[PDB]
Amino acid sequence: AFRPLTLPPKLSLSDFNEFIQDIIRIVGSENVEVISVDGSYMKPTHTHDPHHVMDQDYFLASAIVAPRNVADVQSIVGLANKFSFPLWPISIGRNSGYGGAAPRVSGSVVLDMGKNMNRVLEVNVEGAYCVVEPGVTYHDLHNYLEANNLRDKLWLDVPSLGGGSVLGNAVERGVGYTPYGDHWMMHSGMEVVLANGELLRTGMGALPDPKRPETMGLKPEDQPWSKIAHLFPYGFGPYIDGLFSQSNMGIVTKIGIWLMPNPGGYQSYLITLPKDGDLKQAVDIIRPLRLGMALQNVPTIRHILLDAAVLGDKRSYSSRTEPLSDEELDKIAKQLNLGRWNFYGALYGPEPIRRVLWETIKDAFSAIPGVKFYFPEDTPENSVLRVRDKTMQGIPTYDELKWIDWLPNGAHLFFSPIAKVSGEDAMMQYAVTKKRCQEAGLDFIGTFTVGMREMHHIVCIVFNKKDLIQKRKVQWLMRTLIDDCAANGWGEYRTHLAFMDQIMETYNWNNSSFLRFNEVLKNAVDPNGIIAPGKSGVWPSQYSHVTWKL
Amino acid sequence: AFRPLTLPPKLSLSDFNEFIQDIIRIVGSENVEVISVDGSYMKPTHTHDPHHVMDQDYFLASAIVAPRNVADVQSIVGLANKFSFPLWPISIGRNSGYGGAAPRVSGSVVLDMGKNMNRVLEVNVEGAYCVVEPGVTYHDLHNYLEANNLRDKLWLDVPSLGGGSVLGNAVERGVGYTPYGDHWMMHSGMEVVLANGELLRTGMGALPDPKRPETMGLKPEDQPWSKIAHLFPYGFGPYIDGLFSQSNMGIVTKIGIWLMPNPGGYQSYLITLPKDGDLKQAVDIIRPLRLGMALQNVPTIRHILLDAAVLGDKRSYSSRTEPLSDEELDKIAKQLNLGRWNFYGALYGPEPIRRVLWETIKDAFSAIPGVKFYFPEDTPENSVLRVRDKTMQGIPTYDELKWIDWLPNGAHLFFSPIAKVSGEDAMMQYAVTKKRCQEAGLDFIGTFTVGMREMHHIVCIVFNKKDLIQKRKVQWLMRTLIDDCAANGWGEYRTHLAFMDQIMETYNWNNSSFLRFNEVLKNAVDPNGIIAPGKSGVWPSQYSHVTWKL
Amino acid sequence: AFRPLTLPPKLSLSDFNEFIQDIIRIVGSENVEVISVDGSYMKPTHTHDPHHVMDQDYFLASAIVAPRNVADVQSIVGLANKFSFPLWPISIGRNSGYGGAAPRVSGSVVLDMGKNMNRVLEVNVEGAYCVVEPGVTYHDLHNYLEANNLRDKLWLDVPSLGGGSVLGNAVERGVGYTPYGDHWMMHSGMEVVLANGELLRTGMGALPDPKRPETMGLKPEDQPWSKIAHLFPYGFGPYIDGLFSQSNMGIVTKIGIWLMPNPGGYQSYLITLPKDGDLKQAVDIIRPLRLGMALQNVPTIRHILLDAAVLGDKRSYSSRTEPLSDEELDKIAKQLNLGRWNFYGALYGPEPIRRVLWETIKDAFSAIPGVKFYFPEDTPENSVLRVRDKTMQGIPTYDELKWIDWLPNGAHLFFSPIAKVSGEDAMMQYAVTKKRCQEAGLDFIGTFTVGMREMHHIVCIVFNKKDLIQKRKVQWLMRTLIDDCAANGWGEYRTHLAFMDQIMETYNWNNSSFLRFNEVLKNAVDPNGIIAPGKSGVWPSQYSHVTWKL
Ligand SMILES: *Cc1cc2c(cc1C)nc1c(=O)[nH]c(=O)nc-1n2C[C@H](O)[C@H](O)[C@H](O)COP(=O)(O)OP(=O)(O)OC[C@H]1O[C@@H](n2cnc3c(N)ncnc32)[C@H](O)[C@@H]1O
Ligand SMILES: *Cc1cc2c(cc1C)nc1c(=O)[nH]c(=O)nc-1n2C[C@H](O)[C@H](O)[C@H](O)COP(=O)(O)OP(=O)(O)OC[C@H]1O[C@@H](n2cnc3c(N)ncnc32)[C@H](O)[C@@H]1O
Ligand SMILES: *Cc1cc2c(cc1C)nc1c(=O)[nH]c(=O)nc-1n2C[C@H](O)[C@H](O)[C@H](O)COP(=O)(O)OP(=O)(O)OC[C@H]1O[C@@H](n2cnc3c(N)ncnc32)[C@H](O)[C@@H]1O
């Protein structure tokens, strides 16, 4: 196809068309689509930002291409290297809040890996792990195991929603809420197509499975892996694996995620904290608990509007357009039988063990006036506890997409700085976030996910995508929170297309040595600057900073 | 469009056409025109030299392109860099006498910035300045202020005519006749598109106006400027601004010109000097006056033929074809009640102050036998004083285009060397200019504009554009005056396309170190040699001097 | 000489010594000195920062070399190019508050130009200008004129002190208080030695003075300049002059400074403003006054501690260590018969004219309750008016060095942002400055110098150089003021070695395009990076930003 909406830098119409036709000879017109529509979460767009804050066609594909197999990606990349055409790889494209599917460089080809490179590749019981392709969604994976009755043997770890990509999410350093919740740390043995087009597999993946009759003549992509590939991540020598989480260093075609065995015993719970400032005490109680392993999963402390919005849009709680009051927040908390902050956790294991931990937790949190403990059974049919009970045992659900509907054309955009597991730090962080929210005219909504020694504070910005005035406030709000948090010694762990440069400019110790070192590795492996110029603010040398920085 | 009259160096027909069509996709065929007609001053040509001395198609565009906005110029430049196509930027193209609109390199695209980048951008009263685009003509600016009733608060400074470009004129280091008459020195905060295509704003323009809700997501071009941008020119560090007056270092898209507040009191005047050699005494009287601030504007000493020709063509004063005589010049001076040289000035400010200065001036000039003082009121309806009275208070007029009609197909070409504010120097300069004029068979016509310590001597050459014999004498006359004045220690301040190289070769102290240093800066910023190769004789390294020097 | 304290980057001891000995063969051991002592203002150090805020040997020379003539500099530069040795040129080295004489890169050779290149080259009366060499101090120039009885014909323009370099101060874009107070704008015709070592003279200086018997065979440096060199700055073509104010693009060996004729009438004056908050109304009164030319020089608005400290150290007004109070500030103003802010001006010209202006001014300022008008005659023997009366008429004095003695080991360090000529802006600027000052434990002391449309706010930081706790507070103070003023849309006009980078990172509009463009010109003209790496933050490409940025 003929004439796109936006072309990639330095490319002519003539070169594009030659390339697209060459791409078509390889994947079929069935697998190619040229932009000459936001969609939903259940059927996600792939050409632009569905939760757009910039104009909606600001980060816009010139085409969507989707490989049949690993060999298609080799050929595509060769073709990108002939013409110098940028590729923006996706797995599912469910990254809304962070850019969705859009490419940082308008005009790139979005490479949809998920459409055809779909397969649950292996579910190994004794090593308790699985090998997945970009397309295996969490739901699918769930369903794979149900299909073979493996769910009494192995469990998954899922995010809040169930449609994301196990792989895609894992390269983003995404979080989940069971003991295996730190997705990135659960991996082992990834297969990459680099910017020169060669296929590499990390760690024990570089150790060839030995020759045998049945595996002769297979294309690299399709060979088995040696026994230890997905059991020990390190391999030998430099542990390059991390260079492929949040970066532009290659295209990931396989990945091993470790799976948590059935623990033989489970139970969710909800601790509710009455007062807005019970967050400080709450968190100080959580410090030793997490660090001491009484708290086994990644328990989350939710804000009250986060739970309220799951249950209903704001219109349903007030007709008021400006942020809610302190008093109304108490009144809504009381309505749902939730407190001002709500702590969510799960206990895992034999009853004897579960019993002791729970008693220890229960007693710790009893030090807060008015706290109330609930299991799933004790809460309304529609409660968040019953949704998270699914979530905290590896079952994917979609119930939590509703809070995105807080306001009319609800779009979320996440501000995600990390905080100490300490009441003071937390209050400080929230104190600053909260202020900016009310200056912009936005309800504050969020969650802290409790990591071992750190907390990921997901400030959940919901806004009206069809409101120019508001979109301008969020951009104002986001960059002001970047600066503020920066100024308090906190930085974001993950972000949106339009905030990457500002967040990478936050990580400037010793004159931005960190980004400088990254540019060296990027330009080395990608001489042409073809694999996603811009991710995490790393620009190859052919993208002038003055022209491309946001 | 298909096949041009003259193409740019090294370019093929095939490359041109690809480029022009690419340009058309960006600006629309509405904004592009291919040369496959001299026009007037009120409707100026843009493809060649309207006051041509060389063949009329000697400096000829291959196309005229005109951007919609700043982003169009970025894209155009990118395209010039792909194909190595020379761009010859204009604002209005009213430079006749200096080349008009034509490009030094035949075959370049004339980039008409004035057609669409038209806007009076800001008229700030308290800082007393304005921010204008290439297209704001002087007349327009005048009219902007009338439209908002700002003319009792702020005044302009205009050239002799009112159609020029405030910006265009200001980058040429053009002159005007009020206290703000040194156009270039009145600026502060320019926005440039360089040869690599990046947008830069000078001085305090590099100091970002801080983030606020209402200005989020604007394209660089369109962001506000910080408070001090147009009040302090210097900024911090190297003061690059001058690199963009008379040069090929970038394309200027905005500019701040300082505006002179209503002074609360005004009055023009005409001092007439009888004798041709009263110029020497006159100027010696002006020395201390200017330097002492009794003379506040840029008073001009006009030749008698300059004033005579404003009133009528030469046919109206004599039928004679050869230059007029000394005796006839007296007779024409007496006819109009003007002397042989005529001094024009204006007093600005409270009456008390005006009173004292005028008395001081009056008394100084009384030392010349026969001198006569006139205000506007005292002169015929059609007098030059009444035209300049407009001019010296910031009101643009066009009355003075008539002297261009001295001879039949009247074309002016300016020889503009600078002289000392000293009678001797002046007489010398005039003595040499005058001789050459009569050797070529041309009346001598001119004006000295009195700067603080220097005088700009505009020798006003009028000639018949449809007379090959004469055009050959002017070329002879111009280069001979270049050599002569050079040999007397004087150089031109500004010139025509065909005289640039000879004038830049006049500024050869220490083996042309000055031009050598400039070539280094040019080749550095413009690797491809795309922005107007040749302006002021600076040639990028891909334009062999042997091939391109005139 | 043998083994220095700090060497320049990448240089060996063996290369150094070869270079220094080669330098000795050209200038003599008499003109060379190797560092293997702060001094005073009257006898200034040249190896480091006398007003140090960083360790006192932080910016430290490796040697001091001083050329005999211009050829010495051509040879030195050649040698720096052979060995890649950085040169830090100075004229006098009296830049304390801004780094003194110290080089941004430790280990450079400080090039003292002032020791031997001393001469008032020409004092031309009819063109009313002078040509000076690095060494001509203001006091010398003053003295040159008295020696020939030129002071009844031409006057100078001087900063607060008289020891500075007319040239050096003029290239730093320094200020003075008569009608010629904008030093840089008064220049015309500079001679530079570039990084490649060729000698270039700007503007009309490129226009050779014509051959004559008496000037045959002269070395370029020593030839005469053509008549218009020092009368018209522009010349022809690109106006490169500004590339040499606050930059690393060449070594300045000569410069023309225009001189203000005797105006025939002078009178100083002091308007005192009672209340701290009468600055806002004062400044509003000044707006139209400056803009209207009733205010003819650069009248300064001084703080009350600026005046008090001239008269005495703080010990003399209080024994208190922390910043004074509001009430004590009133008590000290009342003591000296000064108000809380004090405005200093001068009227210039025929009495008739002076009379009118002064009445206008007097009447304007009468709008402030309690204001009092004083001429020199009416103030104590030791008053600031009597010092400034010298100052505003071109006479250099040193009385004002005393405020530097506010505290024990008094060192000044200037914070110099620019502000609008508007009360509101002024107060805002002062409100922010003032807060920071008291947070760090320092009296606020400053002066606004009133430009036409802008004000230079010189916040006068005095601190104890022998107090590590305090030096750390001023570095904290200085970078906090940079940030704050930056966030309020104000940037500094000039600064100290250690604040360059941060101030150049403040002028980052459109992704630092302004600095990027300067790096291209810098690397182009200085392939080896030898002339003063770092001035104004511009680092040639062999100085990694991660290694050298502060
Ligand atoms: C809206 C939202 C998002 C969300 C969430 C809750 C809501 C309401 N809860 C999350 C959670 O609890 N934990 C978490 O980590 N993320 C959460 N999200 C964010 C996102 O919606 C989900 O995380 C989702 O799984 C992320 O998107 P998905 O995995 O589907 O989609 P993606 O666009 O493909 O993103 C992958 C990005 O990583 C690179 N990439 C991806 N695949 C590859 C391959 N094969 N090779 C190379 N690079 C790859 C790219 O950078 C890409 O943009
Ligand atoms: C015929 C004539 C000319 C004239 C004059 C009187 C007469 C009878 N009186 C003048 C005067 O009193 N003072 C003066 O400075 N010039 C006078 N002129 C000359 C000219 O006609 C006017 O000065 C007029 O304003 C100049 O032309 P104008 O401003 O309209 O037109 P221009 O062709 O655009 O010229 C600009 C040139 O500068 C560069 N340029 C211009 N704009 C840009 C932008 N945006 N970016 C980059 N470069 C730019 C080019 O070099 C261009 O050719
Ligand atoms: C302590 C003080 C300082 C001061 C002042 C009052 C006091 C009490 N009042 C000032 C004022 O009213 N206006 C002003 O501009 N400055 C004022 N100062 C600051 C300083 O002391 C004086 O301004 C003084 O004139 C500045 O120093 P000076 O001219 O003597 O000395 P310098 O070290 O040479 O500094 C020049 C710097 O510029 C570059 N430079 C200098 N010369 C060259 C040459 N030839 N070529 C290339 N670069 C040059 C360097 O960056 C150098 O460090």
Side-chain angles (χ1 to χ4, degrees), chain A residues 232-354 356-516:
Chain A
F232 185 65
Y234 298 155
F236 174 78
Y239 185 33
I240 67 167
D241 300 47
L243 258 174
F244 310 103
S245 22
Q246 300 196 6
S247 86
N248 35 50
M249 314 287 290
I251 304 170
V252 170
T253 56
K254 279 130 181 90
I255 196 155
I257 292 311
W258 296 317
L259 296 176
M260 198 208 199
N262 194 311
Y266 182 61
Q267 176 55 100
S268 44
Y269 61 89
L270 157 63
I271 298 154
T272 75
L273 324 158
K275 281 285 193 295
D276 180 33
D278 281 334
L279 179 64
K280 138 133 186 78
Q281 170 162 45
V283 189
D284 287 341
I285 281 151
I286 313 191
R287 219 205 92 257
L289 280 190
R290 184 80 165 79
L291 232 45
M293 301 159 336
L295 285 182
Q296 337 192 247
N297 79 354
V298 181
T300 68
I301 302 161
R302 303 168 54 116
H303 182 264
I304 198 309
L305 282 182
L306 185 66
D307 275 318
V310 174
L311 299 192
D313 66 20
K314 190 188 184 192
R315 270 159 211 210
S316 83
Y317 299 89
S318 184
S319 210
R320 191 168 152 160
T321 256
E322 277 288 301
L324 294 182
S325 78
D326 224 81
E327 299 56 48
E328 298 158 284
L329 292 178
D330 293 336
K331 284 162 188 175
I332 296 175
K334 83 197 180 171
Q335 288 191 19
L336 333 175
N337 264 286
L338 304 175
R340 269 270 232 144
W341 284 93
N342 297 65
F343 182 68
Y344 291 76
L347 315 161
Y348 297 85
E351 191 274 350
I353 291 175
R354 272 183 289 148
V356 188
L357 307 175
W358 181 231
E359 269 173 24
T360 305
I361 311 183
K362 206 157 144 201
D363 200 56
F365 278 97
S366 304
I368 311 183
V371 60
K372 298 237 213 58
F373 310 92
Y374 303 83
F375 304 161
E377 284 315 333
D378 306 332
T379 49
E381 199 232 32
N382 79 337
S383 68
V384 153
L385 192 33
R386 315 195 154 213
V387 170
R388 308 218 78 72
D389 177 67
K390 271 143 238 151
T391 310
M392 280 185 303
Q393 88 183 281
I395 310 160
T397 65
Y398 304 82
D399 303 87
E400 296 206 54
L401 255 173
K402 223 288 162 277
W403 65 253
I404 288 148
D405 290 306
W406 183 237
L407 318 178
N409 295 285
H412 50 7
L413 164 90
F414 302 125
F415 175 81
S416 327
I418 309 298
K420 278 150 84 137
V421 184
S422 96
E424 158 205 280
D425 195 52
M427 296 294 297
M428 208 170 61
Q429 207 169 73
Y430 176 51
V432 183
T433 312
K434 184 154 77 185
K435 184 205 220 59
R436 290 324 186 166
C437 279
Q438 275 72 231
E439 287 174 40
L442 282 181
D443 294 292
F444 167 94
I445 318 173
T447 344
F448 299 100
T449 78
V450 196
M452 182 77 107
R453 294 170 158 77
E454 51 89 0
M455 298 200 287
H456 283 65
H457 190 7
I458 305 301
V459 173
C460 294
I461 310 204
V462 344
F463 62 98
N464 200 13
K465 7 164 182 164
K466 304 199 188 164
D467 184 7
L468 307 73
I469 282 195
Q470 213 183 7
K471 305 186 84 179
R472 258 177 265 115
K473 281 143 137 215
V474 158
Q475 290 191 204
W476 179 78
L477 173 75
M478 182 67 164
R479 306 195 179 276
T480 303
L481 301 148
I482 297 169
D483 292 322
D484 281 358
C485 291
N488 282 261
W490 293 317
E492 278 72 84
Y493 105 103
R494 178 170 165 221
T495 17
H496 192 293
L497 299 164
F499 299 114
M500 293 171 185
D501 303 316
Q502 185 170 356
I503 281 131
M504 183 70 112
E505 173 69 25
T506 259
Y507 295 77
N508 68 1
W509 189 70
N510 194 200
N511 304 302
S512 298
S513 151
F514 183 58
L515 176 56
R516 268 346 116 217

Side-chain angles (χ1 to χ4, degrees), chain A residues 10 12 472 475-476 544 546, chain B residues 18 82 198 212-213 216-217:
Chain A
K10 276 152 194 143
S12 84
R472 258 177 265 115
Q475 290 191 204
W476 179 78
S544 137
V546 160
Chain B
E18 203 195 342
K82 167 169 277 188
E198 307 168 12
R212 85 190 179 270
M216 310 299 308

Side-chain angles (χ1 to χ4, degrees), chain B residues 522-537:
Chain B
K522 170 56 166 206
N523 275 322
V525 309
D526 178 16
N528 291 338
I530 73 177
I531 302 308
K535 177 60 161 152
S536 316

Side-chain angles (χ1 to χ4, degrees), chain A residues 164-200:
Chain A
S165 157
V166 175
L167 167 323
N169 199 256
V171 284
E172 277 284 73
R173 290 209 290 279
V175 181
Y177 312 95
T178 90
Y180 283 41
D182 176 333
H183 292 167
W184 179 253
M185 287 319 215
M186 296 292 93
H187 88 98
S188 212
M190 34 183 325
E191 175 194 273
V192 190
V193 165
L194 306 154
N196 65 11
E198 307 168 12
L199 246 182
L200 173 172

Side-chain angles (χ1 to χ4, degrees), chain B residues 48-98:
Chain B
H48 66 302
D49 191 14
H51 280 226
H52 48 93
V53 247
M54 299 302 302
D55 297 308
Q56 165 211 39
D57 72 327
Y58 194 68
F59 296 123
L60 189 77
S62 70
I64 309 316
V65 173
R68 265 105 53 62
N69 54 228
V70 162
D72 276 4
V73 193
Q74 300 200 267
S75 316
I76 293 160
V77 173
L79 274 146
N81 283 301
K82 167 169 277 188
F83 303 88
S84 289
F85 205 139
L87 312 196
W88 184 265
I90 41 141
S91 265
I92 284 300
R94 252 163 205 146
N95 222 20
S96 22
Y98 299 128

Side-chain angles (χ1 to χ4, degrees), chain B residues 46-210 212-319:
Chain B
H46 285 142
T47 64
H48 66 302
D49 191 14
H51 280 226
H52 48 93
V53 247
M54 299 302 302
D55 297 308
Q56 165 211 39
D57 72 327
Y58 194 68
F59 296 123
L60 189 77
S62 70
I64 309 316
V65 173
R68 265 105 53 62
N69 54 228
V70 162
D72 276 4
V73 193
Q74 300 200 267
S75 316
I76 293 160
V77 173
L79 274 146
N81 283 301
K82 167 169 277 188
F83 303 88
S84 289
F85 205 139
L87 312 196
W88 184 265
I90 41 141
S91 265
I92 284 300
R94 252 163 205 146
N95 222 20
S96 22
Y98 299 128
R104 236 233 76 183
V105 168
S106 263
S108 320
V109 169
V110 157
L111 190 90
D112 168 334
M113 304 266 312
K115 168 150 169 220
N116 305 324
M117 327 177 40
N118 254 180
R119 300 154 319 144
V120 166
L121 288 175
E122 186 186 18
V123 158
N124 193 288
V125 177
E126 50 160 338
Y129 69 86
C130 68
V131 174
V132 116
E133 288 185 304
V136 181
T137 68
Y138 280 112
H139 208 111
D140 297 333
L141 183 59
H142 178 253
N143 276 354
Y144 178 97
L145 300 156
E146 310 269 57
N148 312 72
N149 285 331
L150 295 166
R151 195 201 174 174
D152 303 279
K153 306 218 192 80
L154 320 167
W155 300 3
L156 298 196
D157 186 284
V158 292
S160 288
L161 310 178
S165 157
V166 175
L167 167 323
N169 199 256
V171 284
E172 277 284 73
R173 290 209 290 279
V175 181
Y177 312 95
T178 90
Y180 283 41
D182 176 333
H183 292 167
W184 179 253
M185 287 319 215
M186 296 292 93
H187 88 98
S188 212
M190 34 183 325
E191 175 194 273
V192 190
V193 165
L194 306 154
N196 65 11
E198 307 168 12
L199 246 182
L200 173 172
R201 348 259 215 187
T202 76
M204 290 286 194
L207 195 282
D209 187 36
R212 85 190 179 270
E214 317 66 43
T215 37
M216 310 299 308
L218 297 181
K219 262 190 265 211
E221 317 98 75
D222 316 307
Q223 312 176 353
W225 308 51
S226 65
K227 334 153 157 166
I228 324 303
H230 311 108
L231 321 161
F232 185 65
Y234 298 155
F236 174 78
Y239 185 33
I240 67 167
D241 300 47
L243 258 174
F244 310 103
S245 22
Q246 300 196 6
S247 86
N248 35 50
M249 314 287 290
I251 304 170
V252 170
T253 56
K254 279 130 181 90
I255 196 155
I257 292 311
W258 296 317
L259 296 176
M260 198 208 199
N262 194 311
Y266 182 61
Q267 176 55 100
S268 44
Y269 61 89
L270 157 63
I271 298 154
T272 75
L273 324 158
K275 281 285 193 295
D276 180 33
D278 281 334
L279 179 64
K280 138 133 186 78
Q281 170 162 45
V283 189
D284 287 341
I285 281 151
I286 313 191
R287 219 205 92 257
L289 280 190
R290 184 80 165 79
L291 232 45
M293 301 159 336
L295 285 182
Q296 337 192 247
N297 79 354
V298 181
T300 68
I301 302 161
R302 303 168 54 116
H303 182 264
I304 198 309
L305 282 182
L306 185 66
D307 275 318
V310 174
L311 299 192
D313 66 20
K314 190 188 184 192
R315 270 159 211 210
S316 83
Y317 299 89
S318 184
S319 210

